[PDB]
Design an enzyme around this catalytic site. Structure first.
Site, PDB file in Angstrom:
ATOM      1  CG  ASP A  30      -1.892   0.981   1.619  1.00 42.68           C
ATOM      2  OD1 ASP A  30      -2.574   0.826   0.879  1.00 42.68           O
ATOM      3  OD2 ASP A  30      -1.474   1.956   2.222  1.00 42.68           O
ATOM      4  CD  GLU A  80      -2.843   2.531  -3.063  1.00 47.77           C
ATOM      5  OE1 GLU A  80      -2.097   2.834  -2.155  1.00 47.77           O
ATOM      6  OE2 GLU A  80      -4.031   2.900  -3.032  1.00 47.77           O
TER       7      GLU A  80
END
Ligand SMILES: [Ca+2]
Ligand SMILES: [Ca+2]
Ligand SMILES: [Ca+2]
Ligand SMILES: [Ca+2]
Ligand code: NA
Length: 585
Positions: free
Chosen positions: A336, A366
């Site tokens: 993330d 991401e």
């Protein structure tokens, strides 16, 4: 008034050759069946000897035996008990029984994202109670995921977040707590216990599916206590002021199990909350510097910001990385907020974690960057060859298709077509951030989603991700499974672009493996709306071969000449504007 409420199988369905009956359910009780025919639409011949039987408002048709890969129509005229007449039909396609035989090592890879933002909330908890316990469900479902062709599952963050049982997983609190310790008011996470999770991983490995962990390494939230911290002269807000920072974490509930590391002020570069003034800001702590990031000043995002210059912190987090693969047996990670975390640290950890095991650990960041050059330049900066990223560039094209796009441009769209970067693309259509009921930064792909999945799942490069919410909540399963069949058995061998793409049609060819019989495919997708059937002359690379549309849309076959060319077709509509032509034999 007489109408068909439903049929089993449903119109448009792909069915087993062992289908023994067709049930038609009507609005009124039925007095008569005046005409009934079950027709093979390729040869245009009615199946002789079908029977039917009237039961109130239902009609059961049987006494047939369906051939694999054949398209059939069931036509009926019924008269109901108030002498209404209704004429109609249903159509359906029979699954192939003898699929191409793909050597296990070449079988295509395909990821399921096993969550969505609103899971187990509001009406979702009502209509889908099975998701009150995601680890148990994935366990239950492993064999059907594998039958669908999934080779890996990306899980939501499995650690304890600051909202406890209501945390979707990104309010990261304790990485070493996987719903094992009473912390944040809950032993379990929103998704289950550590044991349940270990269950699911065995379930999944049992059926030959990998399990990726969603590691949120950028920040921490819900600290155990606050601390008085002086702010640097270089802080954007309140420079040289003292603030009260929620920066103390000692994980009382876990009591040193797995790691006795604890966190304070010196573990963080800064925070966004001053509990003295009760004000938000961006606060940089005395003698800390924001860590090196691809774009200037993007280390700070939210929460208390980890200082990946701090060696103790680097070490505890490398140790968790290692624990997750080697001890908890995960096969990879999603990363993330990968561009808000020290690039030198991401490369170091990806290398430490990769180096600690013989398994080839999969990693995907991401990095929400819609320009391909900018995204490649982020890959270059991090400079770790294992690092894949989500192809938000390609998705920007699917956003363009929402109101019509220039479809030939799919030849060069996304990371997945950038020479030297194509295999580092993890392609997708929607996810928990882009498809969410409230508070999205984008618009979901609310139109032409099937087209967008067909493109990614037929492609020779990248690794495609199906979204749980598409598959199970919006109920695209029926149509997606046909695309998943295509990928699993047909989408093999070199890929080719064609020369006749245009504003509304994109076609693509997978030629199949030479040493495998009956694989290969011609994809055609369209953003057209005219409501009718368009042809393109395409070189399939398979001379003298009969093909059929495994989507059920085009109810004819296409046989290629001795050069391998054929007129392949698609219906220019939103609803049905994707076709996947595979060999019949
Ligand atoms: Ca950061
Ligand atoms: Ca720092
Ligand atoms: Ca167009
Ligand atoms: Ca072949
Ligand atoms: Na930092």
């Amino acid at each position: 008034s007489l109408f068909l409420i439903e049929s089993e199988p449903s119109t448009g369905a792909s069915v087993s050759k062992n289908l023994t009956e067709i049930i038609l359910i009507f609005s009124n009780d039925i007095n008569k069946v005046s005409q009934l025919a079950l027709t093979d639409l390729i040869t245009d011949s009615d199946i002789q000897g079908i029977d039917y039987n009237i039961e109130g408002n239902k009609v059961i048709i049987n006494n047939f035996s369906l051939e694999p890969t054949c398209n059939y129509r069931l036509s009926y005229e019924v008269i109901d008990i108030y002498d209404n007449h209704l004429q109609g039909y249903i159509e359906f396609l029979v699954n192939q029984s003898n699929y191409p035989q793909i050597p296990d090592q070449e079988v295509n890879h395909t990821i399921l994202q096993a969550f969505y933002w609103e899971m187990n909330t509001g009406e979702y908890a009502t209509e889908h109670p099975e998701e009150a316990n995601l680890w148990n469900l994935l366990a239950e479902r492993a064999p059907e995921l594998a039958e669908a062709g999934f080779t890996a599952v990306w899980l939501p963050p499995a650690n304890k977040g600051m909202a406890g049982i209501h945390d979707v997983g990104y309010g990261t609190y304790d990485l070493w707590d996987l719903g094992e310790f009473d912390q944040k008011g809950t032993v379990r996470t929103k998704y289950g216990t550590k044991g349940e999770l270990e269950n699911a991983i065995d379930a999944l490995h049992n059926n030959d599916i990998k399990v990726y962990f969603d590691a949120v390494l950028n920040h921490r939230m819900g600290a155990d206590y606050a601390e008085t911290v002086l702010l640097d002269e270089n802080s954007r807000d309140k420079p040289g002021q003292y603030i009260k920072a929620w920066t103390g974490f000692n994980f009382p509930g876990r009591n040193g199990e797995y790691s006795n590391f604890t966190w304070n002020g010196q573990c963080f570069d800064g925070t966004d909350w001053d509990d003295y003034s009760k004000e938000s800001g961006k606060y940089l702590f005395d003698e800390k510097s924001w860590d090196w990031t691809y774009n200037w000043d993007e280390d700070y995002l939210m929460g208390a910001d980890v200082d990946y210059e701090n060696e103790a912190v680097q070490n505890d987090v490398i140790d968790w990385g290692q624990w997750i693969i080697n001890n908890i047996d995960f096969d990879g990670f999603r990363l993330d907020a990968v561009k808000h975390i020290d690039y030198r640290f991401i490369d170091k950890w990806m290398s430490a974690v990769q180096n600690s095991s013989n398994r080839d650990v999969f990693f995907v960041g991401e990095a929400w960057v819609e320009d391909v050059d900018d995204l490649k330049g982020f890959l270059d900066t991090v400079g770790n060859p294992d690092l894949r990223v989500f192809d938000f560039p390609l998705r920007s094209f699917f956003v363009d298709m929402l109101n019509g796009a220039y479809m030939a441009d799919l030849r060069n769209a996304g990371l997945v077509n950038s020479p030297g970067y194509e295999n580092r693309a993890v392609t997708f259509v929607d996810n928990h951030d882009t498809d969410r009921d409230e508070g999205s930064y984008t618009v979901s792909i609310y139109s032409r989603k099937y087209q967008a999945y067909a493109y990614i799942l037929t492609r020779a490069e990248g690794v495609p991700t199906v979204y749980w919410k598409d598959y199970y909540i919006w109920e695209m399963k029926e149509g997606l499974d046909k695309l998943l069949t295509a990928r699993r058995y047909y989408a093999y061998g070199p890929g080719y672009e064609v020369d006749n793409n245009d504003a509304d049609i994109y076609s693509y060819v997978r030629s199949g493996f030479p040493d495998v019989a009956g694989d290969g495919l011609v994809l055609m997708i369209s953003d057209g709306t005219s409501g009718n059937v368009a042809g393109k002359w395409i070189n399939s690379r398979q001379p003298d071969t009969e093909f059929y549309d495994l989507t059920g849309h085009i109810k004819e076959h296409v046989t290629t000449d001795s050069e391998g060319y054929g007129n392949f077709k698609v219906i220019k509509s939103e609803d049905k504007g994707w076709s996947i032509w595979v060999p019949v034999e």
